[PDB]
Each structure stands twice: as structure tokens, then as C-alpha cells.
Short mmCIF file of C-alpha atoms (C1' of nucleotides) in Angstrom, two decimals:
data_model
loop_
_atom_site.label_atom_id
_atom_site.label_comp_id
_atom_site.label_asym_id
_atom_site.label_seq_id
_atom_site.Cartn_x
_atom_site.Cartn_y
_atom_site.Cartn_z
CA UNK A 1 -38.43 11.87 19.15
CA UNK A 2 -38.48 12.50 15.40
CA UNK A 3 -35.31 14.09 14.02
CA UNK A 4 -34.15 15.38 10.64
CA UNK A 5 -31.48 13.65 8.56
CA UNK A 6 -29.87 14.43 5.20
CA UNK A 7 -29.86 11.74 2.51
CA UNK A 8 -27.83 11.55 -0.70
CA UNK A 9 -29.89 9.83 -3.40
CA UNK A 10 -28.90 8.18 -6.65
CA UNK A 11 -28.72 10.08 -9.93
CA UNK A 12 -32.20 10.52 -11.38
CA UNK A 13 -33.75 8.32 -8.67
CA UNK A 14 -34.96 11.05 -6.29
CA UNK A 15 -38.60 10.57 -7.29
CA UNK A 16 -38.52 6.78 -6.86
CA UNK A 17 -36.85 7.08 -3.45
CA UNK A 18 -39.46 9.70 -2.51
CA UNK A 19 -42.35 7.36 -3.34
CA UNK A 20 -40.63 4.48 -1.53
CA UNK A 21 -40.15 6.61 1.59
CA UNK A 22 -43.74 7.87 1.49
CA UNK A 23 -44.75 4.20 1.31
CA UNK A 24 -42.85 3.64 4.57
CA UNK A 25 -44.66 6.65 6.13
CA UNK A 26 -41.71 8.94 6.83
CA UNK A 27 -42.00 12.67 6.18
CA UNK A 28 -39.56 14.02 3.61
CA UNK A 29 -38.67 17.46 2.27
CA UNK A 30 -36.86 18.47 -0.89
CA UNK A 31 -36.67 21.87 -2.61
CA UNK A 32 -38.77 21.93 -5.77
CA UNK A 33 -39.03 24.40 -8.64
CA UNK A 34 -40.84 24.29 -11.97
CA UNK A 35 -39.06 26.21 -14.74
CA UNK A 36 -37.97 26.09 -18.37
CA UNK A 37 -35.31 23.49 -19.17
CA UNK A 38 -33.99 22.72 -22.64
CA UNK A 39 -34.00 18.91 -22.26
CA UNK A 40 -31.89 17.78 -25.25
CA UNK A 41 -32.89 20.92 -27.17
CA UNK A 42 -36.67 20.98 -26.60
CA UNK A 43 -37.56 23.96 -24.40
CA UNK A 44 -40.11 22.58 -21.93
CA UNK A 45 -41.50 23.61 -18.54
CA UNK A 46 -40.71 20.87 -16.00
CA UNK A 47 -39.77 20.59 -12.33
CA UNK A 48 -36.27 20.04 -10.96
CA UNK A 49 -35.05 20.28 -7.35
CA UNK A 50 -32.65 22.74 -5.80
CA UNK A 51 -29.62 21.03 -4.27
CA UNK A 52 -30.05 17.96 -6.49
CA UNK A 53 -29.77 14.44 -5.06
CA UNK A 54 -30.52 15.61 -1.50
CA UNK A 55 -33.46 14.82 0.77
CA UNK A 56 -34.39 15.82 4.33
CA UNK A 57 -36.13 12.93 6.11
CA UNK A 58 -37.83 13.49 9.47
CA UNK A 59 -38.20 10.25 11.41
CA UNK A 60 -37.60 8.64 14.79
CA UNK A 61 -34.92 5.91 14.78
CA UNK A 62 -36.88 4.04 17.46
CA UNK A 63 -39.88 3.60 15.15
CA UNK A 64 -37.81 2.68 12.08
CA UNK A 65 -34.09 1.91 12.11
CA UNK A 66 -31.52 3.95 10.21
CA UNK A 67 -30.26 0.92 8.26
CA UNK A 68 -33.77 0.34 6.89
CA UNK A 69 -33.76 3.84 5.40
CA UNK A 70 -30.20 3.26 4.16
CA UNK A 71 -31.45 0.16 2.30
CA UNK A 72 -34.47 1.94 0.81
CA UNK A 73 -34.58 1.68 -2.98
CA UNK A 74 -33.41 4.84 -4.72
CA UNK A 75 -31.45 6.16 -1.71
CA UNK A 76 -27.67 6.16 -2.08
CA UNK A 77 -26.45 6.84 1.46
CA UNK A 78 -26.93 8.89 4.59
CA UNK A 79 -25.03 12.18 4.69
CA UNK A 80 -22.86 11.47 7.73
CA UNK A 81 -19.91 13.24 9.35
CA UNK A 82 -17.88 10.87 11.48
CA UNK A 83 -19.34 7.56 12.58
CA UNK A 84 -22.81 8.83 13.48
CA UNK A 85 -25.17 10.29 10.85
CA UNK A 86 -25.56 14.05 10.77
CA UNK A 87 -28.46 15.80 12.52
CA UNK A 88 -30.18 18.69 10.73
CA UNK A 89 -31.37 21.41 13.15
CA UNK A 90 -34.96 22.60 12.92
CA UNK A 91 -33.79 26.13 12.10
CA UNK A 92 -32.31 24.88 8.82
CA UNK A 93 -35.59 23.13 8.00
CA UNK A 94 -37.55 26.33 8.70
CA UNK A 95 -35.19 28.38 6.54
CA UNK A 96 -35.51 25.82 3.74
CA UNK A 97 -39.30 26.04 3.99
CA UNK A 98 -38.90 29.81 3.50
CA UNK A 99 -36.02 29.38 1.00
CA UNK A 100 -37.53 30.42 -2.37
CA UNK A 101 -34.99 31.43 -5.05
CA UNK A 102 -35.49 32.06 -8.76
CA UNK A 103 -32.35 30.95 -10.64
CA UNK A 104 -31.18 29.01 -13.71
CA UNK A 105 -29.35 25.71 -14.17
CA UNK A 106 -26.49 24.51 -16.36
CA UNK A 107 -28.72 22.43 -18.70
CA UNK A 108 -30.84 25.61 -18.93
CA UNK A 109 -27.88 27.77 -20.00
CA UNK A 110 -29.29 28.90 -23.38
CA UNK A 111 -32.20 31.29 -22.90
CA UNK A 112 -33.96 33.49 -25.51
CA UNK A 113 -31.41 35.58 -27.40
CA UNK A 114 -27.91 34.42 -26.48
CA UNK A 115 -24.76 32.94 -28.01
CA UNK A 116 -25.00 29.26 -29.02
CA UNK A 117 -22.40 27.31 -31.01
CA UNK A 118 -23.57 24.99 -33.79
CA UNK A 119 -21.23 21.99 -34.13
CA UNK A 120 -23.03 19.71 -36.60
CA UNK A 121 -24.29 19.61 -40.16
CA UNK A 122 -23.12 21.90 -42.93
CA UNK A 123 -22.80 24.71 -40.33
CA UNK A 124 -20.59 22.85 -37.85
CA UNK A 125 -18.32 24.95 -35.64
CA UNK A 126 -20.05 28.33 -35.97
CA UNK A 127 -21.60 30.87 -33.59
CA UNK A 128 -25.19 32.11 -33.67
CA UNK A 129 -27.77 34.05 -31.65
CA UNK A 130 -30.57 31.78 -30.41
CA UNK A 131 -34.01 33.16 -29.57
CA UNK A 132 -36.82 30.57 -29.48
CA UNK A 133 -37.90 26.94 -30.22
CA UNK A 134 -40.57 27.08 -32.89
CA UNK A 135 -42.90 24.32 -31.81
CA UNK A 136 -41.01 21.82 -29.66
CA UNK A 137 -38.27 20.04 -31.64
CA UNK A 138 -37.35 22.97 -33.93
CA UNK A 139 -35.20 25.84 -32.64
CA UNK A 140 -33.94 28.69 -34.80
CA UNK A 141 -30.71 30.68 -34.66
CA UNK A 142 -29.09 33.65 -36.39
CA UNK A 143 -27.01 31.38 -38.60
CA UNK A 144 -23.87 33.22 -39.70
CA UNK A 145 -22.54 33.23 -43.26
CA UNK A 146 -19.48 34.94 -44.72
CA UNK A 147 -21.54 38.11 -45.30
CA UNK A 148 -24.16 38.36 -42.53
CA UNK A 149 -26.39 36.34 -40.22
CA UNK A 150 -29.92 35.24 -41.10
CA UNK A 151 -32.54 33.53 -38.95
CA UNK A 152 -32.96 29.84 -39.75
CA UNK A 153 -34.31 26.81 -37.89
CA UNK A 154 -31.99 23.86 -37.26
CA UNK A 155 -32.25 20.60 -35.35
CA UNK A 156 -32.06 21.17 -31.61
CA UNK A 157 -29.59 18.41 -30.70
CA UNK A 158 -26.91 19.71 -33.09
CA UNK A 159 -25.98 22.92 -31.24
CA UNK A 160 -24.65 23.43 -27.72
CA UNK A 161 -24.05 26.41 -25.47
CA UNK A 162 -20.59 27.97 -25.54
CA UNK B 1 -0.44 16.76 -20.15
CA UNK B 2 -2.85 14.71 -22.28
CA UNK B 3 -0.12 12.73 -24.05
CA UNK B 4 1.06 11.25 -20.75
CA UNK B 5 -2.55 10.06 -20.28
CA UNK B 6 -3.46 9.21 -23.87
CA UNK B 7 -6.91 8.21 -25.08
CA UNK B 8 -5.85 5.23 -27.18
CA UNK B 9 -8.39 4.14 -29.83
CA UNK B 10 -9.96 0.77 -29.06
CA UNK B 11 -9.97 -0.35 -32.75
CA UNK B 12 -13.63 -1.35 -32.31
CA UNK B 13 -15.19 2.10 -32.43
CA UNK B 14 -14.82 2.73 -28.68
CA UNK B 15 -12.11 4.44 -26.63
CA UNK B 16 -9.99 2.89 -23.88
CA UNK B 17 -9.87 5.39 -21.02
CA UNK B 18 -7.10 5.60 -18.43
CA UNK B 19 -7.91 5.79 -14.73
CA UNK B 20 -6.27 9.22 -14.50
CA UNK B 21 -8.87 10.62 -16.90
CA UNK B 22 -11.67 9.20 -14.74
CA UNK B 23 -10.14 10.71 -11.59
CA UNK B 24 -9.75 14.10 -13.28
CA UNK B 25 -13.35 13.96 -14.52
CA UNK B 26 -14.58 13.14 -11.01
CA UNK B 27 -12.57 16.00 -9.52
CA UNK B 28 -13.85 18.45 -12.15
CA UNK B 29 -17.46 17.35 -11.63
CA UNK B 30 -17.15 17.71 -7.86
CA UNK B 31 -15.56 21.15 -8.21
CA UNK B 32 -18.32 22.32 -10.56
CA UNK B 33 -21.03 21.00 -8.23
CA UNK B 34 -19.43 22.72 -5.24
CA UNK B 35 -19.15 25.98 -7.20
CA UNK B 36 -22.83 25.80 -8.16
CA UNK B 37 -23.86 25.02 -4.58
CA UNK B 38 -21.80 27.92 -3.22
CA UNK B 39 -23.29 30.26 -5.83
CA UNK B 40 -26.76 29.03 -4.80
CA UNK B 41 -26.26 30.27 -1.20
CA UNK B 42 -26.84 26.77 0.13
CA UNK B 43 -27.11 26.15 3.90
CA UNK B 44 -24.32 24.92 6.16
CA UNK B 45 -24.83 21.13 6.09
CA UNK B 46 -25.14 20.81 2.30
CA UNK B 47 -22.06 22.91 1.54
CA UNK B 48 -20.06 21.08 4.22
"C1'" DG C 1 -2.18 12.74 48.07
"C1'" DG C 2 -3.16 13.85 43.28
"C1'" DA C 3 -0.60 14.85 38.85
"C1'" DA C 4 3.04 13.76 35.51
"C1'" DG C 5 5.73 11.11 33.03
"C1'" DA C 6 6.40 6.81 31.66
"C1'" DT C 7 6.23 2.38 30.20
"C1'" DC C 8 4.57 -1.57 28.57
"C1'" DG C 9 1.97 -4.79 26.40
"C1'" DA C 10 -1.53 -4.73 22.94
"C1'" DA C 11 -4.02 -3.08 18.84
"C1'" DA C 12 -3.97 -0.77 14.36
"C1'" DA C 13 -1.72 0.86 10.07
"C1'" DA C 14 1.92 0.59 6.33
"C1'" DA C 15 5.14 -1.71 3.16
"C1'" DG C 16 7.02 -5.82 0.84
"C1'" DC C 17 6.92 -10.05 -1.26
"C1'" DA C 18 13.50 -12.08 -7.93
"C1'" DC C 19 14.17 -11.79 -13.25
"C1'" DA C 20 13.20 -12.77 -18.32
"C1'" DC C 21 10.17 -14.75 -22.04
"C1'" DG C 22 5.90 -17.22 -24.65
"C1'" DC C 23 0.55 -18.30 -25.03
"C1'" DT C 24 -4.98 -17.88 -24.26
"C1'" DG C 25 -9.34 -15.26 -22.90
"C1'" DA C 26 -11.95 -10.70 -21.13
"C1'" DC C 27 -13.02 -6.12 -21.16
"C1'" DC C 28 -11.79 -0.85 -21.82
"C1'" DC C 29 -19.11 2.66 -17.29
"C1'" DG C 30 -24.64 1.09 -17.29
"C1'" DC C 31 -29.01 3.32 -16.70
"C1'" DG C 32 -32.89 6.68 -16.08
"C1'" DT C 33 -33.89 9.94 -19.53
"C1'" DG C 34 -35.07 11.78 -24.22
"C1'" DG C 35 -36.62 12.01 -28.68
"C1'" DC D 1 -35.50 1.64 -30.73
"C1'" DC D 2 -30.96 5.07 -31.57
"C1'" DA D 3 -28.51 8.67 -28.51
"C1'" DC D 4 -26.81 10.61 -23.96
"C1'" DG D 5 -24.63 12.50 -20.19
"C1'" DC D 6 -23.44 12.73 -15.65
"C1'" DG D 7 -22.28 10.11 -10.30
"C1'" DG D 8 -20.13 5.60 -9.20
"C1'" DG D 9 -20.11 0.71 -4.03
"C1'" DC D 10 -23.67 -2.48 -5.29
"C1'" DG D 11 -27.74 -3.17 -4.25
"C1'" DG D 12 -31.15 -3.03 -1.33
"C1'" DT D 13 -36.07 -2.02 1.65
"C1'" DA D 14 -28.45 -5.91 4.51
"C1'" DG D 15 -24.63 -7.40 4.26
"C1'" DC D 16 -20.41 -8.33 1.67
"C1'" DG D 17 -14.94 -10.24 4.63
"C1'" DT D 18 -12.40 -14.77 6.90
"C1'" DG D 19 -4.61 -19.35 5.55
"C1'" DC D 20 1.98 -13.64 6.07
"C1'" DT D 21 5.89 -11.17 7.96
"C1'" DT D 22 8.23 -7.20 9.65
"C1'" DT D 23 8.30 -2.39 11.14
"C1'" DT D 24 6.25 1.82 12.98
"C1'" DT D 25 2.84 4.46 15.65
"C1'" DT D 26 -0.28 5.12 19.24
"C1'" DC D 27 -3.41 4.00 23.15
"C1'" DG D 28 -5.45 2.25 27.51
"C1'" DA D 29 -4.24 0.63 31.70
"C1'" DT D 30 -1.33 0.79 35.13
"C1'" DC D 31 2.42 2.28 37.92
"C1'" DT D 32 5.33 4.63 40.29
"C1'" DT D 33 7.39 8.32 41.72
"C1'" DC D 34 7.48 12.37 43.10
"C1'" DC D 35 6.79 17.99 45.58
"C1'" U E 1 14.24 6.41 -37.79
"C1'" C E 2 6.97 8.49 -37.37
"C1'" U E 3 7.55 4.29 -43.37
"C1'" A E 4 4.08 0.24 -43.16
"C1'" U E 5 1.94 -2.80 -39.67
"C1'" A E 6 2.64 2.47 -34.49
"C1'" U E 7 -2.93 -0.17 -26.78
"C1'" G E 8 -3.52 -1.16 -22.04
"C1'" U E 9 -4.39 -3.93 -17.87
"C1'" C E 10 -6.91 -8.46 -14.99
"C1'" A E 11 -7.33 -13.76 -14.81
"C1'" G E 12 -5.35 -18.49 -16.18
"C1'" C E 13 -0.99 -20.91 -17.35
"C1'" G E 14 3.77 -22.72 -19.13
"C1'" U E 15 9.27 -22.28 -19.79
"C1'" G E 16 14.29 -21.26 -18.02
"C1'" U E 17 15.92 -20.60 -13.63
#
DNA sequence: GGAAGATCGAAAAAAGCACACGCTGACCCGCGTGG
DNA sequence: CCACGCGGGCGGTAGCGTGCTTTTTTCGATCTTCC
RNA sequence: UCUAUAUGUCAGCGUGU
């Protein structure tokens, strides 16, 4: 009978492993959320998964062997405790199907109106209040001078979150 | 201390990195990932 | 008459393998991702 | 085509290994000895 | 002696033993 297994995938290869597994006709589940990342400074709405580099594959070992899945392109290794691979109970799968959080991620640390440190250009090593990308590749900050801070747009890749 | 695991310049624009630095980086990355997963209220198998 | 300890050969794991000097090469993350 | 920033066994839809000696620990199988 | 010149390992060797 079909059972659920947990798979650790390679870095940035979750999508490719997903397509490869769907080619082999095995059901897979992975948490998915679309939200606003910063992506090297350009605030864009894209999709990333909760619990990154993890997949839940439902398959019967009789139909397709475990080693075949282990050798699937884009899949790093089975999540196994002891010799045998781990078995995910159906209750966990149900909870995951109802598991719908709204959170943020470390690459998405700087949101509208927060402290960001500029470390490049003529303003290297200073603190500013960041509000919004104007366009895509231009983000502005409350650049601080000796007297006061004034809004000004700087290159996105130069600054980083504190 | 960093001096006991120095980051010697490679004289070619790169940096020769000791194995201790790599091990510390791996430990720090794993600790940060575990902290994020715990803060995300992840289920039993993933956190284990 | 079944448990306890016991023991005994066999399998698995750990630690070691001299000193000093001179020379050469060959690195000292790669890759999906992003702009 | 110029950075870049995190998992890492590698790569693949599996298997890679493969010429020492001594010491220590533990285990299965038996045994044997009894209360 | 912080006055110049201020790295590591792996592989291949060779020398004295």
C-alpha cells in the first residue's frame, strides 16, 4: 500500500526534483506560499516553500523501489532514522494540508519602513530607514547626514539588513 | 579565537580558509535553520 | 526443569605505524540564481 | 556576462570499496550448573 | 626583534640514516 516518506532535496533543486518525480507518476506534497521577497534588492512577489528542501512523497515501494527515488535527479537523500527510511503518518499529512501560516523569511527581513545599513558607495557604513523600491531596481532610504536624514534612492545591492 | 584559525590571504585575490572555519560555518547554519524551523511550529518529523 | 551466569570463539571498532632536510606541482567550494 | 550566497557525498533516475598488526569491546550460541 | 621580504596542506620524489 502507498505510504508517505520525507525527502531532503538539493539546494535550489526542489522544482526540478518535483518535475522529475511527477514524470515518474508519484504523488508529492510540499508547502507553498507566494509572498514578497527582496531577491538581491528587488522587491518582487514570488513563491517559496515552507520547510525548505523537504518533500513528502506518497508511493508504494512494491510499484517503484526506494533506491530509484533516491537516485532521482534533484533529490538529495531520504530522511531516514536508523537503517530503514522514516514513515510519515497520515495525520501529519492532513495537518500539513490544513497548515496555512503567514510569516516572513530571512531574505525578506527588510520590509517597508525599517532599519537598513548601507555599506557601499560614499555612504558606506551608515544606518537608514527603508520604505519602498521605486520601480524594481531602485530602492530609497532615509539617508543620514551629519545634520538630519533625507529620502534618497540608492542601488539595491549596496545595502543590507542589520 | 580567530587568530588561532587565521584567514591567510592567498596572494592571488582569494582567501585560503581553514577547515575549522568551514565546520563553524556549518554548525552556525544548522543552528540557524533549526531555530527558524522551531519558530515556524514545524511538525514532529521535520524538527527531529 | 527453566533461568542465570558464564564463557568462548568470532565479529566489529580503535589506534599505530622513527627523525631531519631539500625539490617540484596542485589547489585553497561550484552552481542555480540574479541582475 | 559579472556577482552571490548558502548546503556539501557525488551523482544519479546506482554504486563507489577490495595486499597490516595489535588491543579492546561486545555478541550469539551454547553450556552448564544450579534451587 | 613586527624592519623588509612576515601561508597552508595533498601528491610525487630524493638525501642522510
